[PDB]
Amino acid sequence: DIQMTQSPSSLSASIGDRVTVTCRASQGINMQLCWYQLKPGKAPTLLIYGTSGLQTGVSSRFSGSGSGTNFTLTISSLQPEDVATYYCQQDYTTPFTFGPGTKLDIK
Amino acid sequence: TLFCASDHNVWATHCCVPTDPNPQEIHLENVTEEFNMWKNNMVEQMHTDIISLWDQSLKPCVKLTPLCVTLQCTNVTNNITDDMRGELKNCSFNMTTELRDKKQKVYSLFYRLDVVQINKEYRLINCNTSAITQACPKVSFEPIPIHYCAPAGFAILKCKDKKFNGTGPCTNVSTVQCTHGIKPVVSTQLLLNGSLAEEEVIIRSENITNNAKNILVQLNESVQINCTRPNNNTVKSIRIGPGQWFYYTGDIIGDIRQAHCNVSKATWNETLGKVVKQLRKHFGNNTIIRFANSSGGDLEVTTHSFNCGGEFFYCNTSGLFNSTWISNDSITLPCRIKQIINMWQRIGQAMYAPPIQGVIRCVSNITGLILTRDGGSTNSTTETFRPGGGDMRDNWRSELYKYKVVKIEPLGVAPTRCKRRV
Amino acid sequence: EQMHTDIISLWDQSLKPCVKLTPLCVTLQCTNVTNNITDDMRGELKNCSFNMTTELRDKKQKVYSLFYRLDVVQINNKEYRLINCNTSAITQ
Amino acid sequence: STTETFRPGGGDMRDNWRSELYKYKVVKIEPLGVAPTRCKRR
Amino acid sequence: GFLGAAGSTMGAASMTLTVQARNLLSDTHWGIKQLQARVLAVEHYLRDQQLLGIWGCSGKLICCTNVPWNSS
Amino acid sequence: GFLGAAGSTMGAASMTLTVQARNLLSDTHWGIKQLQARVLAVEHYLRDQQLLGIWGCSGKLICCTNVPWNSSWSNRNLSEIWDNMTWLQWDKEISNYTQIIYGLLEESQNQQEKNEQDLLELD
Amino acid sequence: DTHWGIKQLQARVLAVEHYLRDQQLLGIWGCSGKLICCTNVPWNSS
Amino acid sequence: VQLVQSGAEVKMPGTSVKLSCKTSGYTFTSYNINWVRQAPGQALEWMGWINPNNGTTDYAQKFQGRVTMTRDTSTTTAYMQLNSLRSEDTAVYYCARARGGYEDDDGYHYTGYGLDSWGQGVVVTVSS
Ligand SMILES: *[C@@H]1O[C@H](CO)[C@@H](O[C@@H]2O[C@H](CO)[C@@H](O[C@@H]3O[C@H](CO[C@H]4O[C@H](CO)[C@@H](O)[C@H](O)[C@@H]4O)[C@@H](O)[C@H](O[C@H]4O[C@H](CO)[C@@H](O)[C@H](O)[C@@H]4O)[C@@H]3O)[C@H](O)[C@H]2NC(C)=O)[C@H](O)[C@H]1NC(C)=O
Ligand SMILES: *[C@@H]1O[C@H](CO)[C@@H](O[C@@H]2O[C@H](CO)[C@@H](O)[C@H](O)[C@H]2NC(C)=O)[C@H](O)[C@H]1NC(C)=O
Ligand SMILES: *[C@@H]1O[C@H](CO)[C@@H](O[C@@H]2O[C@H](CO)[C@@H](O)[C@H](O)[C@H]2NC(C)=O)[C@H](O)[C@H]1NC(C)=O
Ligand SMILES: *[C@@H]1O[C@H](CO)[C@@H](O[C@@H]2O[C@H](CO)[C@@H](O)[C@H](O)[C@H]2NC(C)=O)[C@H](O)[C@H]1NC(C)=O
Ligand SMILES: *[C@@H]1O[C@H](CO)[C@@H](O[C@@H]2O[C@H](CO)[C@@H](O)[C@H](O)[C@H]2NC(C)=O)[C@H](O)[C@H]1NC(C)=O
Ligand SMILES: *[C@@H]1O[C@H](CO)[C@@H](O[C@@H]2O[C@H](CO)[C@@H](O)[C@H](O)[C@H]2NC(C)=O)[C@H](O)[C@H]1NC(C)=O
Ligand SMILES: *[C@@H]1O[C@H](CO)[C@@H](O[C@@H]2O[C@H](CO)[C@@H](O)[C@H](O)[C@H]2NC(C)=O)[C@H](O)[C@H]1NC(C)=O
Ligand SMILES: *[C@@H]1O[C@H](CO)[C@@H](O)[C@H](O)[C@H]1NC(C)=O
Ligand SMILES: *[C@@H]1O[C@H](CO)[C@@H](O)[C@H](O)[C@H]1NC(C)=O
Ligand SMILES: *[C@@H]1O[C@H](CO)[C@@H](O)[C@H](O)[C@H]1NC(C)=O
Ligand SMILES: *[C@@H]1O[C@H](CO)[C@@H](O)[C@H](O)[C@H]1NC(C)=O
Ligand SMILES: *[C@@H]1O[C@H](CO)[C@@H](O)[C@H](O)[C@H]1NC(C)=O
Ligand SMILES: *[C@@H]1O[C@H](CO)[C@@H](O)[C@H](O)[C@H]1NC(C)=O
Ligand SMILES: *[C@@H]1O[C@H](CO)[C@@H](O)[C@H](O)[C@H]1NC(C)=O
Ligand SMILES: *[C@@H]1O[C@H](CO)[C@@H](O)[C@H](O)[C@H]1NC(C)=O
Ligand SMILES: *[C@@H]1O[C@H](CO)[C@@H](O)[C@H](O)[C@H]1NC(C)=O
Ligand SMILES: *[C@@H]1O[C@H](CO)[C@@H](O)[C@H](O)[C@H]1NC(C)=O
Ligand SMILES: *[C@@H]1O[C@H](CO)[C@@H](O)[C@H](O)[C@H]1NC(C)=O
Ligand SMILES: *[C@@H]1O[C@H](CO)[C@@H](O)[C@H](O)[C@H]1NC(C)=O
Ligand SMILES: *[C@@H]1O[C@H](CO)[C@@H](O)[C@H](O)[C@H]1NC(C)=O
Ligand SMILES: *[C@@H]1O[C@H](CO)[C@@H](O)[C@H](O)[C@H]1NC(C)=O
Ligand SMILES: *[C@@H]1O[C@H](CO)[C@@H](O)[C@H](O)[C@H]1NC(C)=O
Ligand SMILES: *[C@@H]1O[C@H](CO)[C@@H](O)[C@H](O)[C@H]1NC(C)=O
Ligand SMILES: *[C@@H]1O[C@H](CO)[C@@H](O)[C@H](O)[C@H]1NC(C)=O
Ligand SMILES: *[C@@H]1O[C@H](CO)[C@@H](O)[C@H](O)[C@H]1NC(C)=O
Ligand SMILES: *[C@@H]1O[C@H](CO)[C@@H](O)[C@H](O)[C@H]1NC(C)=O
Ligand SMILES: *[C@@H]1O[C@H](CO)[C@@H](O)[C@H](O)[C@H]1NC(C)=O
Ligand SMILES: *[C@@H]1O[C@H](CO)[C@@H](O)[C@H](O)[C@H]1NC(C)=O
């Protein structure tokens, strides 16, 4: 199995700032790390498929990139609506695994 | 009858005969020979054999007869840019399963060019004419170099004169067993990935003042063209019958944008001016040469058609053939894509092109053009050249123009001073 | 190698003109054959019934037949399909 | 222990054929040849 | 090589007749077309050999006969 | 009978050339395979006949030529080759020189034809 | 028409084989290249 | 596309729960359905996925034995059953659709696009 982790737990930023978070994969996942946004009381949704490219309906403010194991999600300009716990997932292998999420607060 | 040779690909499977490394040719000193590319039967054979490969390749593939059913379709209006509005139809139908008594509801996306309204209820466009066969996804039609070779008793003569225009005497000739490799790229208005002229642009025609004849223009520089299908298409499949799978586009990811092709603008303008200079040699250096787009007709004729990544594109060349010639940025050509194809100007015998997963990109070399003159008269001595329609044979004639096939005849007689000894 | 190839060919050509059983790949309704069965044969035979085609396109007929269990697979009196329906057509 | 275990196998039909065709071989006849002699063409 | 003498005079060309002779005997539809091509190569070869036989030139590349040359 | 002389010496086996010579001529898929086989037998036959014609040998089972034997092809006695060796052994012994010898046989006949272009006896 | 084509090839190949068979015999008998050939075999009154 | 889940309830430790997910707007048999659990706090975890075309299932090791999945292709719905409950299983259970991959004569090909069309989430609690 492939362990998945994230670094910036409990990150906080001001409205209008640029916000980034990172995610690391054990082994390497062929550039197939997906990102999700989970708000309390709601089903999680998909932001980024693959390591880059947006799910339809997702604002252009979201983007991402990475290496075989080192991946980053970026919000180009933080909005009041972006408070959520973000998750990253390996769609590469069969025993699909999610890492811990990282919560984002407004400063 | 010539046979082919070459160094899951249809071409490789058929032209199974190997080729020689370092093939040799014999220069024929002091031999003058007459060639005529317009009466060349190597072209006719190549055409016929290519048609056969397609028909044989599709022979064992899944028949799609069971899909000729009434469809219920709506327009995709979700995240569609204006350029693509109305292009995609989101359809559903009640399809069979491997068991004859069960059905499933199938949803899929289609291009509007493949679907027509019945009287909303729609049907696949081919239903009123013929059956359609799904091309096998594991069979590749990607062209590879093909060498045509003569049988024993025959020889192929090659014309090496640098300015040879396909017709008349040739003085630098040699004998070969096989032609150079020819890559059988199938296209309409522009010719892709062919050979280049070495000294200048060469314009070849059967009868240059005859408006019923086309003009084949061979460039001495390539023009690079970059084509794409920018969205991430997802391929899904269902079983239709025992052992038979059907492929369709399930879903497109991202805002929908049109397919398109780019050429460098400066390069396109320079290689157009080169053509004009050569045209002036036949029409006069005090006349006006104008370029204009196609006159109208079926999509397969009026656009530039090609196979990119296995997908079938029909690009608008009106952005290229728009100039008047009197004595950085790219040009973007919008394109349309369709899956139901009547190939080789035939009625019926349709094929269905399976969808391709992901984003499609290819880069090709423009090596020549097919042009026609717009009728006319002396008038105001302005003539217009439009991209021609053309036969597929014209695409092979443009490469085989330097080859001729002859038969060897070993007996002969002549007078001498000897007599039967006794 | 030639003997092998020629033999494969004879089988493939000999079945070429024979009745196709595509119409037979239907959902079957089957129960066990329990009439005078020794212990060694329990569960080996099944009594299946189905709606088969007939000479006219608008007619159907009900058919009862016996099958060996190796030829019949359960979908999920239970419903079954022939083992081949998910792989290929089956020529008689 | 030097105990060897043998089991039934096969399934590749060519191996059945091989048991009857093992004694036969196919060859091509090549009728030309040369050799030195004391003969000279005249 | 083969046909290298094509531009040579008749005298010089006749020096190399063997090279031109030794180069004469070298999906259902494709298979049939190829068999037809092989058969014609054989039939044409044999036709020419038969004429040499009839004329009394069998086995020769250069043969002298008694038919006089006509100035016409 | 056919190939009966295969184990015989070259000398003895040279007397059975005729029997060997006489044995050279004697469902869509199946039909094509058989035509394939028949055509090839004819083509091989004709190629051997053409070579003999080129070398100046026609209608002969035994034909003499003017090419000298090279000691580098095989350095053996006449008694050794003809009495203590078979044709199979000989064929293997000199398989390295088959094309060399054939090339020389053709050259010899071409010179012979050039000599025959003279009306002068060339004595 | 596959069947017609095979029948015709059948016929042409066979004609060639018969031709060559007779030519081979003339070769074997020492009569190659001749329409009329004298031999050394005596004629039998039987 | 729409996926609808139901079956929220309170279970006693030792019993089983069977949850359902009805689907529409897509070919039922063309996409694998995944079950994902959201424990209070903690993190999302994958439980397993059923291929609606042939019944092939694949389970996370934590739930082997404990979890079984089935499909109904007549009524286009998927089900998951957790065989023996404990208080550790209190969670929100979600149904999600893989949006990529297809079958073929050569076996299944997975293309790697993520989970979409998530259901609402069904609360299951396990306590007395
Ligand atoms: C004019 O001439 C050009 C140049 O020859 C043609 O461009 C080529 O087109 C082919 C077919 O579309 C391309 O082949 C594909 O290559 C993929 C790999 O790409 C990477 O690796 C190559 C290594 O050589 C790099 O050059 C390239 O930049 C990438 O880094 C394969 O993944 C593709 O595989 C597909 O088919 C197989 C079939 O077995 C499937 O299993 C796969 O899943 C997949 O579907 C394929 O082989 C080729 O790369 C192109 N060359 C270039 C330089 O771009 C033009 O197509 C031709 N123009 C016309 C009109 O024909
Ligand atoms: C389509 O999907 C692919 C993933 O399948 C996206 O590819 C990623 O693109 C970024 C940007 O260059 C790369 O860094 C990643 O490596 C790519 N993924 C992989 C698998 O390597 C692609 O961007 C998407 N395109 C669109 C427009 O939707
Ligand atoms: C498209 O054109 C380019 C040149 O513009 C071709 O690339 C060159 O090919 C020659 C062949 O003799 C090489 O010597 C050069 O080094 C190549 N140039 C570069 C930059 O690589 C290219 O091969 C053409 N493509 C096709 C399909 O014909
Ligand atoms: C064809 O050219 C257009 C530009 O005329 C390219 O589109 C631009 O791509 C850049 C990224 O490289 C974006 O920043 C621009 O905003 C795009 N412009 C527009 C108007 O959308 C296009 O990618 C090229 N296509 C090909 C196949 O080369
Ligand atoms: C087609 O795509 C190629 C890349 O595959 C483009 O070539 C590159 O262009 C950039 C400048 O934008 C150069 O810095 C690179 O060195 C070029 N790479 C190669 C391999 O040549 C090309 O310009 C595109 N052509 C068109 C008409 O858009
Ligand atoms: C398979 O099922 C059929 C249907 O029940 C059996 O046929 C019936 O047998 C009873 C006697 O037990 C008769 O009275 C009925 O008239 C028959 N019905 C029909 C439609 O034929 C059949 O015997 C069963 N076969 C086996 C091996 O158990
Ligand atoms: C293609 O058409 C189907 C209907 O035939 C659409 O399915 C509906 O989707 C909405 C949500 O988008 C659901 O609320 C409805 O219940 C669905 N109806 C059925 C019968 O399933 C589908 O969304 C359409 N796709 C596109 C791209 O337009
Ligand atoms: C779909 O496109 C056609 C284009 O002719 C238009 O007439 C029709 O109203 C459109 N339908 C919808 C639902 O937008
Ligand atoms: C599919 O069949 C049902 C009846 O079972 C019918 O109500 C529905 O309209 C049919 N749908 C299509 C797309 O044919
Ligand atoms: C099939 O339908 C199209 C669209 O109405 C029509 O243009 C075409 O002529 C029809 N084909 C035949 C054979 O009637
Ligand atoms: C033939 O080739 C020679 C070089 O070998 C060249 O000098 C001559 O100009 C060529 N002739 C023609 C007509 O191109
Ligand atoms: C070019 O074409 C003309 C006929 O239009 C022909 O007479 C001439 O021989 C051709 N070749 C060259 C090199 O001009
Ligand atoms: C093509 O021909 C023109 C003739 O004016 C010349 O200037 C140009 O350099 C040539 N290009 C090549 C690649 O030979
Ligand atoms: C070339 O075309 C003209 C028509 O403008 C025609 O009169 C002429 O005969 C044609 N030339 C030849 C050789 O046929
Ligand atoms: C233009 O046409 C004339 C014939 O009227 C010709 O002599 C001249 O070479 C041509 N080209 C140029 C650049 O003048
Ligand atoms: C050619 O361009 C004109 C606009 O100048 C346009 O109306 C016409 O439809 C174009 N021709 C084709 C075949 O698209
Ligand atoms: C080509 O582009 C022109 C742009 O003015 C447009 O009017 C024409 O309809 C287009 N033709 C085709 C075949 O797409
Ligand atoms: C042709 O060029 C003119 C400018 O001279 C431009 O207005 C027109 O739109 C162009 N035609 C096409 C099809 O792009
Ligand atoms: C091509 O570029 C030149 C500048 O180098 C410009 O003068 C010319 O007008 C352009 N071509 C056309 C058809 O406008
Ligand atoms: C058939 O035999 C199996 C044996 O495992 C049994 O489970 C099943 O209930 C039997 N069915 C009938 C109809 O008797
Ligand atoms: C045969 O078809 C009828 C419907 O016409 C159905 O009620 C019956 O159950 C079917 N019987 C079998 C054995 O499949
Ligand atoms: C067909 O069903 C059998 C049931 O035993 C299964 O083993 C096999 O893998 C299935 N094949 C396909 C193509 O679904
Ligand atoms: C061509 O003519 C020249 C004339 O000097 C001659 O020397 C040469 O051998 C000739 N070429 C051939 C193939 O005979
Ligand atoms: C051949 O010569 C004869 C005289 O012997 C003469 O009458 C005849 O016209 C000449 N030519 C032909 C073709 O017969
Ligand atoms: C085999 O060798 C013996 C040696 O004594 C000889 O007599 C016999 O004839 C040879 N066999 C053949 C077929 O020549
Ligand atoms: C053949 O004889 C020559 C001398 O005439 C000698 O140089 C050569 O090496 C011999 N053998 C071969 C294989 O060349
Ligand atoms: C030449 O003879 C040697 C043995 O001395 C052998 O290994 C080699 O393969 C032979 N070459 C040919 C062409 O027969
Ligand atoms: C040939 O003649 C001999 C007598 O010399 C005789 O014995 C023999 O039987 C004759 N041949 C035939 C076939 O009768």
Numbering used by the authors:
A (entry chain L): 1 to 107
B (entry chain A): 51 to 57, 66 to 141, 150 to 185, 189 to 309, 312 to 323, 323A, 324 to 397, 411 to 505
C (entry chain C): 102 to 141, 150 to 185, 188 to 203
D (entry chain C): 463 to 504
E (entry chain B): 521 to 546, 568 to 613
F (entry chain E): 521 to 546, 568 to 664
G (entry chain F): 568 to 613
H (entry chain H): 2 to 52, 52A, 53 to 82, 82A, 82B, 82C, 83 to 100, 100A, ...
How do the authors describe this structure?
Recently, we developed an approach that uses cryo–electron microscopy (cryoEM) for characterization of polyclonal antibody (pAb) responses elicited by vaccination or infection (cryoEMPEM) on the level of immune sera. Here, we developed a method to determine mAb sequences directly from cryoEMPEM maps. This hybrid approach, consisting of electron microscopy (EM) and next-generation sequencing (NGS), enabled sequence assignment of variable regions of polyclonal Fabs (Fv) including the complementarity-determining regions (CDRs). We used structural data from the recently published rhesus macaque immunization experiments with soluble HIV Env trimers.
To validate the sequence prediction algorithm, we applied it to Rh.33104 pAbC-1 and Rh.33172 pAbC-2 cryoEMPEM datasets. These binding affinities are comparable to mAbs isolated from BG505-immunized rhesus macaques in published studies. The final map resolutions for the Rh.33104 mAb.1 and Rh.33172 mAb.1 complexes were 3.3 and 3.5 Å, respectively. The structures revealed that both antibodies bound to the same epitopes as the pAbs computationally sorted from cryoEMPEM maps. The overlay of the maps/models from experiments with monoclonal and polyclonal Fabs showed excellent agreement in both cases. On the backbone level (Cα), the root mean square deviation values between the mAb and pAb model were 0.668 and 0.721 Å for Rh.33104 and Rh.33172 datasets, respectively.
